[PDB]
């Protein structure tokens, strides 16, 4: 009859094109809830993320908007695939919800961390993160929020990043968490943490809590330098400058051989190279931390290096949208609506 139809998953309603069936809840990636479904026209598993009245507020609207524009304009093997977008309401008047349909991967990295990988697997997964990140950066998009739960893998060892809901807790770069002002290598810190976590097999800086992060961090890495302290917001400085001061530990002591798989047949795929790469990523002072190009160029990673993966044409944004500009509840709704209407096409 009407194209759409309605399913209750516990308290939530998914109103979606009829092609999408047997929905199952799969998670709550940041700013919406997500379901797996069977797509009967493609004959294919997909994931459907619902953004409920995304225009409700300043925060959400910006994010939904960013996520909408970039999902369209960014296509790459290592960034999650866009399949469809829609709303079931028939007008700007009546408009409430946005649905984004995506490929369904098999797992998120949190699972991979738990398991014993060999060097080609870790390296290759990290290579994939980095190539994805480089694609985003080439367009001046900085992700700022990479973590295990927004990076997904398949049983054929492919890896894709999702989210640019935040794209413009110890996973975030210190420069971010200290309102410091930041460049692209903000994302390298995150990769450092995730790499470390893949090697350790669990949480890198054990809590308990979102700010017992920091302390375990400086206890582990060492307190950062004076110049670095200088750069801080005078007020936030004196918090940081107060802490007991620590030397930190070498990377040999933080990531000893025992934690690594056997060295591989291949020269560059060894504990000492991984540890080297780590110690250039997992670095608190961003201006001493390596870039995505150097990390791609690094011996531990560069074995996979493929220029046609790593050097694709940038996504292009209208930069008409630079979207820092405060808008109002009302205008957001219009902006997102046009963005959705423009995207809509497949049913």
């Amino acid at each position: 009859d009407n194209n759409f139809y309605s399913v209750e998953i516990g308290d939530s309603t998914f109103t979606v094109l009829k092609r999408y069936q047997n929905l199952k809840p799969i998670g709550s990636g940041a700013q919406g809830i997500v379901v797996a479904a069977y797509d009967a026209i493609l004959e294919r598993n997909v994931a459907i993320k619902k953004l409920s009245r995304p225009f409700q507020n300043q925060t959400h609207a910006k994010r939904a908007y960013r996520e909408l524009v970039l999902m369209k304009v960014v296509n790459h093997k290592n960034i999650i695939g866009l399949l469809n977008v829609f709303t079931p309401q028939k007008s700007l008047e009546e408009f409430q919800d946005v649905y984004i349909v995506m490929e369904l991967m098999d797992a998120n990295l949190s699972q991979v961390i738990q398991m014993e990988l060999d060097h080609e697997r870790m390296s290759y997964l990290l290579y994939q993160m980095l190539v994805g990140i480089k694609h985003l950066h080439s367009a001046g998009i900085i992700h700022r929020d990479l973590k295990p739960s927004n990076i997904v893998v398949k049983s054929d060892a492919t890896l894709k990043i999702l989210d640019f809901g935040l794209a413009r807790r110890y996973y975030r770069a210190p420069e971010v968490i200290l309102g410091m002002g930041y460049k692209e290598n903000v994302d390298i810190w995150s990769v450092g943490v995730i790499m470390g976590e893949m090697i350790k097999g669990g949480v890198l800086f054990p809590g308990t809590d979102h700010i017992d992060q920091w302390n375990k961090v400086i206890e582990q890495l060492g307190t950062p330098s004076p110049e670095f302290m200088k750069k801080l917001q005078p007020t936030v400085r004196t918090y940081v400058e107060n802490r007991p001061k620590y030397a930190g530990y070498s990377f040999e002591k933080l990531f000893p051989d025992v934690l690594f798989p056997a060295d591989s047949e291949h020269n560059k795929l060894k504990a000492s190279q991984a540890r080297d790469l780590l110690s250039k990523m997992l670095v608190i002072d961003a201006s001493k931390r390596i870039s995505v190009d150097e990390a791609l160029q690094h011996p531990y990673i560069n074995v996979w290096y493929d220029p046609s993966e790593a050097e694709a044409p940038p996504p292009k944004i209208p930069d008409k949208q630079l979207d820092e500009r405060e808008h109002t509840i009302e205008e957001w709704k219009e902006l997102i609506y046009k963005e959705v209407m423009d995207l809509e096409h497949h049913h």
């Binding site: 098999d106 991979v112 080609e120 290759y124 398949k154 060892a157 591989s264 047949e265 795929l269 074995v303």
Partner: peptide, 11 residues
Amino acid sequence: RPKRPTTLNLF
């Protein structure tokens, strides 16, 4: 030199 991995066990 090394082949890209093509399997990853997620069971």
